[PDB]
Design a protein around this nucleic acid. Structure first.
Length: 173
RNA sequence: AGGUAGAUUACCUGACGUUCCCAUCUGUGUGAACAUAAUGGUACUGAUCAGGCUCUAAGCAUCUUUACUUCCGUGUUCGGAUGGGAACGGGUGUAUCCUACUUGAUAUGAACCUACC
């Protein structure tokens, strides 16, 4: 997933040529981001590609992709019953990574493919604003858990033998 | 300003009231003859004592209507395309096209030839 900052304007009798539309669109590549941007303008401001013209489409990178932040994502997804607004919380270091988590999470928990979700907004919440029952347990300052039943780690595919010698074991790790 | 012939055929229609008529138009007087009908009401003809009462025309109205624009609304619907989702029924996403009703704002005619004022 990648971020893009897209601006454009419409030059026709219905829209003044001083209104500039901005967005921050998540897409695998800039071609997809532009297509997402143009669907918003058409579905909200009656602005079409033939009657408008793009100004900027530049990537947005995380300022510090080394600090862990609590991301709160507001989104709407279409189900069989109807359309619902859902708030999900994820922990990650980059905005694009958290949005990639959201898409994979929604596709598994709600069986909702990518082309049924619209990311309304994504902000950063505080430490104590995390309400996810599972995610809340790793937010404190004294999180500590022994990882058990470990599978021994192979350094590379070079040492991956099909049949080994002796017995096999797990690791208290 | 008015009258004749018009073209566009409601922005020209319909209802409620208002304003002049100096010329013009209209309404207005009469029935001998052409002509007319059950009726000089119509149509016809002869005329000029009166009149802006109506017609016509100009304007009024939170007037119906009609005519442009926005909005409705990129919502209805739709052309193209899956080993897309659904047990069906039906309904996505993508590249596109995109009404209508309604409502709101404005308007209530423009314009040609001839004659007379």
């Amino acid at each position: 997933m990648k971020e893009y900052y897209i601006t454009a304007r419409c030059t026709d009798k219905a829209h003044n040529p001083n209104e500039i539309f901005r967005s921050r669109v998540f897409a695998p590549n800039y071609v997809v981001a532009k297509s997402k941007f143009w669907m918003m303008l058409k579905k909200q401001h009656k602005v079409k590609k033939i009657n408008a013209e793009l100004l900027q489409c530049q990537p947005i990178f995380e300022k510090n992709p080394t600090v862990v932040k609590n991301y709160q994502i507001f989104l709407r997804y279409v189900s069989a019953g109807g359309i619902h607004n859902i708030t999900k919380q994820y922990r990650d270091v980059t905005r694009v990574g958290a949005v990639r988590q959201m898409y994979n999470d929604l596709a598994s928990q709600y069986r909702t493919r990518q082309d049924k979700i619209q990311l309304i907004s994504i902000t950063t919440v505080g430490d104590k604003a995390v309400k996810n029952p599972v995610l809340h347990q790793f937010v404190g300052h004294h999180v500590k858990f022994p990882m058990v039943h470990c599978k021994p780690v192979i350094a590379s595919k070079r040492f991956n033998l099909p049949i080994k010698a002796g017995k096999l074991t797990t690791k208290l790790c």
